[model samples]
Target: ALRWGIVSVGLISSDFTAVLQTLPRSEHQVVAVAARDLSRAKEFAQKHDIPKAYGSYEELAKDPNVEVAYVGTQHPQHKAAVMLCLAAGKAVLCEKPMGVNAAEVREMVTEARSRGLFLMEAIWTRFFPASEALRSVLAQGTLGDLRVARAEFGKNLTHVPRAVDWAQAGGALLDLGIYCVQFISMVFGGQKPEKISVMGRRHETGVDDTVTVLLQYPGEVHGSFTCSITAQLSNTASVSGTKGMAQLLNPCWCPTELVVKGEHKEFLLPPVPKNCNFDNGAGMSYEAKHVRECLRKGLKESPVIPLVESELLADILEEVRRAIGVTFPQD
Candidate 1:
C-alpha cells in the first residue's frame, strides 16, 4: 500500500484526505498529516484516524514512511511546500496551478526532474471519468474538425479568504478560471494557443473578480472563456465542430454527465458511479488510482496529465494575468 502524508489541514486538504480514505485500504492509506499548529494537526489526525501528526512541515517531510506527500496549502505557498517534500526525496502531488506563475512552475519541474522523482499537479478534473468519455468521443471523430470551444466557471466567492487576498495569489483566473482554461485546452488537444487576449474587472482587493479570454489556435480553432468571483455564471461548457457538438453537463469542470450532438445521433452519458461523500462529483479516487499505477511502474510523471501540461497551463495563466494586470505578492 502507498503510505500518504498530507502537508496542510485546511479545507481543501481535509477534503483530499477524506477522499483518499475512501479508496481501498489495501491500495492507499493516509498515514500522516502536518500543520503549523501542533494542536490542529493532532486534531486533524485524530479526526481522520491518521497514525502520525507533525506540527512542522519539515518533520513530516522527514518521515521516511510518507512515500507520497500531498501539498494542499494555499496557491502562494505551493512552491515552498512542494520543494520541501521533493528535497526529502518524496513523491509529491501538489494542488493546482503548481506555482503562482510559469517561472515558479519551471523551477519546480526542473527540481523534480533533476531528482528523477514523481511530481504532479493535482488538477482532479482531468482524471474524471466524464473527461475520459469526452476524450473518447473526440478521438472517434464524433466532433469532427473541432472549430470552437467555450467554457465558463463562476461563483460568488467574494467573501472567501484567498479569493480576494493578493497575498495568497487570489484571483478569478487562477482560482476559478484555471478550470475554464484547462477545459478549453483539453478540447483542443493541449496545443499552444496562437493568440491570447484577456479583459477583466478587478476586485477592490486589487485582484481580478471577473475576466474574459479569447484564444486562437492553429487550424483556425478558437476558444472563449470567462470566470467570475462576484457573479454566478452558468458554469457550463461546450465544444462545437464541423460534424457535431458536445455539451458538458453543468459544473463542467467536474462534470459527471455529458450530452453529444452529432450529424446522426444525440445521446447522454451518465456520470461514473459514486464512491465518496464529497458531493462534488465522483470521488477523487480516480487520480489516486492513476498515481498509484504510475508509481508502481516507476514513472516520474503522469502520461495522462504530464508535467508539460502543468507547465503550459502556468504559461497560459501567466499571460492572462499579465494581460489583465493581476499581480500577486509573489510576482
Candidate 2:
C-alpha cells in the first residue's frame, strides 16, 4: 500500500480523499492530514478517519511514515506548499495548474527533477475511461485528420469568494478555463501552438470572469474554447476531423461516454458508472490508480501526462493571461 499524506483538507481535498477511500484499501491509504490550524487539522482528521493530524505543513512533510504528499492548498499557495514537500524528499501530487504561472511551475519541476522525486499535476480528466475511449477512436483513423477541437466549461459562481478573489489567484482561466485549455491540449497530443489569440471579460476584482481562446497549431490545426464563472453554459467538448466528429457527452470534463459521428455508423459509446457523486469524487479512481501504478514502478512522472506537458499547458495559459491583461500579485 502507498502511504499518503494530505496537505490542507480543503473542499477539493475532501472530495479527493472520498474517492480514494472507496478504492481497495490495500492499494493506497491516507495516513495523515495537515493544516495551518491544529483544531482544523484535528477536525478534518476525525471527519475522514485519518490516523494523524499536524498543525503545520512542514510537520507532515517530515513525517517518516508519509511516502507521498497531496498538496491541496489554494492555487497561489500551491507552488510554495509543493516545494516544501519536494525539499523534504517527498513525492508530491499537486492539484491542477501546478502553479499560478509557468515560472512557478518551471521552478517546481526543476526541483523535483533535480532531486529525483516523483511529481505530477493532478489533471484527472486525462486518466478517465472516456478519455481513453476518445483517444482510441481517434487512433483508428476513422475520424481522418483531426482539424478542430473545442470545449467550454462554465458555472454561475459570481458570488463565490475564490471565483472573484484576485489575491487568491482566482479566475475563470485558472479555476475553470484550465479544463477547456487541457481539452485542447489532450486532443492535440500536447502540441505547441503556433499562434494564439485570447479575449475575456474581467470581474470587478480584476480577474477574468469569461474567456475565449483560439489556438493554431502546425498543419493549420485549430482549437477554440470558452469558459465562464458568472454564467452556466453547456460544459461540453468536441473534436472534428475531415471524416467525422467525436463529441464528448455532457459534463465533458469527466465524461463517461462519447458520441462518435463516423461515415457509416453513428456510435453511442456505452456509458460508465457515474463517479461524480462526491462520494466517489466524480471518477477520480482512475487517476489515483494511475498514481499508485507509477509509484510502484518507481517512475518519477506520469508518461500519460508528463511534467513537460504540464509546463507546456502552463505556457499556453501564461500567453493567454498576458493577452488578456490578467495579472496576479505573484507576477
Candidate 3:
C-alpha cells in the first residue's frame, strides 16, 4: 500500500480521505494528517482512523512513514504547501486551483522536477471515464476540426462567507470559471487564446462577482464562458466542430453523460459512499488510482493533465482574472 499523509482538515480533505479508504487497503493507507491546530488534526485522524496527527504541516512532511502528501489547502496557500512536501521528498497531489498565478505554479513545478518527485493537480474531472471518452473521441477526430466551445457555470455562494472574501482570493473565476477555462483548455490543449475579451462585475468585497469571457484560439477556434457567484447558471458546456458537436451533459465539469447528435452515452461511476461533499466526488478515486499507477511506473507527471497543463491553466486564469479586474493578495 502507498503511504499517504493528508494536509488540511477541511471538507475536501475529509471527502478525499474517505474515498481513499473506500478503495482496497493494498492500494492506499492514510498514515497521518496535519493541521495548524493540533485538536483539529487529532479530530480528523480519529474520524478517518488514521494513526498519526500533527499540529504543523512541516511535521507531516517530515514523517518517514508517508510517501505522498495530498495537499488540500486554500487557493492562496497551495504553492507553499506543495513546496514544503516537495522539499521533503514526498510526492504530491494538490487540489485546484494549483496556484494563484503562473509564476507560483512554475515555482512548484520547478521544485518537483528538480527533485524528480511525482506531482499532479488533483483535477479529478479529467480523470473521469466520461472525460477520458471525450479525450479519445477528440483524438479520433470524432469532432472533426473543432471550431467553437462554450460553457456557463455558477451558483449563489453568498452563504459561504469566505467565498466572497477578497483576501481569500475568492472570486467567480477562481471558484467557478476554473471548471469553465479548464474545460476549454482540455479541448484546446492548454493553448492560450490569441485574444481575450471579458465582461463582468465585481462583488462589494472587491472580488469579481460575475464574469463572461470570449477567447480566440489558433485556427480560429473560438470559446466562451460565463461564471458567477450571484447568479444561477446552466452549468452546461459544449464543443462544436465541422461535422458534429458534443454537449458535455449537465454538471459539465465532472460529467457522467455525453450527448452527440441526439445520442446519449453514459459512464457509470463505481460504487461510492453517499456522504460525498461534492457531486461526482467518488470519481476522484480515478485520480488516486492513476496516481498510484504513476508512482508504480516511476512517472513524474500525468499524461492526461500534465504539470505544464496546470501551469498553462494558471496563466490562462491569471489573464482572465486580470481582464475581469479580480486580483488575489499573492498576485
Candidate 4:
C-alpha cells in the first residue's frame, strides 16, 4: 500500500483525498494531512478519515509512516513544500507548474537529485489511459512527419481571487496555459523552440488575463496556444502531421476521448468520488498508482512526466511570462 501524507488541506487536496478514500484501503492510505492552521487540518482529517493531522508541514514531513508527500499548496509553494519533504527523506509528488519559474524548479530538482529521493511533478493528464494510447498510436508513425500542434484552454476563474493575483503567482498562463504548453511539448517530444512569440492582456492585478503564444521549432514545426481568464474558451488540444492528425476531446486536461487517424477512441475512466470539488478528480488515481509503481521499482522520477520535461515546461512558461511582461514576485 502507498502511505500518503497530504501537505495541504485546500480544495485540491480535499478532492484528492476524496478520491483516495474511494480506492481500496488495501492499496492506499492517507495517514495524515497538514495545513497552515491546526483547526483546518483537524477538520480535514476528520472529513477524510485520515489518522493524523498536523498544523505545520514540517510535522507531516517528519512522520515516519509517510512514504510520499503530495504537495498541493498554492502556485508559489512547490519549492518550499517539495524541498521540505525531500529534506525529511520523503518521496514527493508535487502538483503541476511545480515552481513559479525554472530557477525555483531547478532548486527543487537539485535537492531531490542530491538526496536520491523520488520526485515528480503531478501532471495528471500524462498518466491518463488516453494519454498512454496517444503515445502508443503516435509511436507507430501513423502521424507521418509532424508539422504543427495547438492547445487552447480557458475559464473565467479570475473570480477565485488568487487566480489573478500576481503575488500568488496566479494567472491564466499558469493556471490554464500550462496545460496547453504541456500539450505542445508532448506533441513535439520536448524539443525546444527555435523562436517564440507571445502576446497578452493583464488584469489590474498585473497578471495576464488573456495570452497567446506561437513557437517555431526545428524542421519548421510550429506550436501555439491561447488562454484567457476573462472568458470561456474551448479547452481542446490537437497535433497534426503530414499524413494525419489527432485530437484530445474537449477539456483536454482531463480528457476521456482522443481522435486519431479518422477513428474516435473512447477512454472511460472510473467514476470520481462524489463532491470532488474539481473536475475529473477521480483521475488522480492514475497518478497515484504510477507513483506507487515507481516507488516499488526504485525509480527516482516518472518517465511519463519526467523531471527533465518539468524543467523544460517551466523554462518555456518562464520565457512566455517574460515575453508578455508579466512578472511574479519571485522574479
TM-score of each: 0.94, 0.94, 0.97, 0.97
In candidate 1, stretches whose alpha carbon ends up further than 4 angstroms from where it belongs are 262-282
True-vs-predicted CA distance for residue 91, candidate 1, Å: 0.6
Give candidate 2's TM-score: 0.94
What's the true lDDT of residue 148 in model 3?
Answer: 96
Candidate 2 off by > 4 Å = 262-280
Q: All models: lDDT?
A: 0.85, 0.86, 0.89, 0.89
lDDT by residue (54-104, candidate 1, tens digit) is 999999999999999999999888899899999999999998878999989
lDDT of 1: 0.85
> Candidate 3 deviates by what RMSD?
1.2
Single out the weakest 10-residue window by summed lDDT for candidate 1: 262-271
Over 4 Å off, model 4: none
Q: Model 4: per-residue lDDT, tens digit, 135-229? A: 87678788998889988988888688888887888888889989999888887877788888999988888788899999998888999999988
